Amino acid sequence: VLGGHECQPHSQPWQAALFQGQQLLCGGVLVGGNWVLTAAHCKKPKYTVRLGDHSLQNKDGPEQEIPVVQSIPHPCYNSSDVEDHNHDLMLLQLRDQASLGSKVKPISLADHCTQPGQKCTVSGWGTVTSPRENFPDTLNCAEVKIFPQKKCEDAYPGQITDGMVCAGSSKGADTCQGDSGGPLVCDGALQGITSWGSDPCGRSDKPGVYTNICRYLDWIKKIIGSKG
Ligand SMILES: [Ca+2]
Q: How many A from CA of 2 to the centre of ligand 1?
A: 21
- Give one DSSP letter per residue of 19-48, joined into a string: ESSS-EEEEEEEEETTEEEE-GGG--SS-E
> What number does CATH give the domain 13-106+215-224?
2.40.10.10
Beta strands in the chain (DSSP E): 5-6, 15-19, 24-32, 35-38, 48-51, 64-73, 90-94, 119-124, 140-146, 164-168, 183-185, 190-196, 208-212
Q: How many A from CA of 8 to the centre of ligand 1?
A: 13
Catalytic annotation, residues: 41, 88, 180
| Resolution value (Å, 1 decimal) | 2.1
Q: How many A from CA of 60 to the centre of ligand 1?
A: 5
Number of H helices, E strands in the chain: 2, 13
Q: How many A from CA of 181 to the centre of ligand 1?
A: 19
Q: Where are the alpha helices (DSSP H) in the chain?
A: 149-155, 217-225
Residue type, 36: V
Q: How many A from CA of 103 to the centre of ligand 1?
A: 13
CA 14/CA 30 separation, integer angstroms: 5
Question: Distance of CA 46 to CAs 23, 80, 88, 150, 180, Å?
Answer: 12, 19, 19, 38, 17
Would you list the domain boundaries of the chain?
A: 1-12+107-214, 13-106+215-224
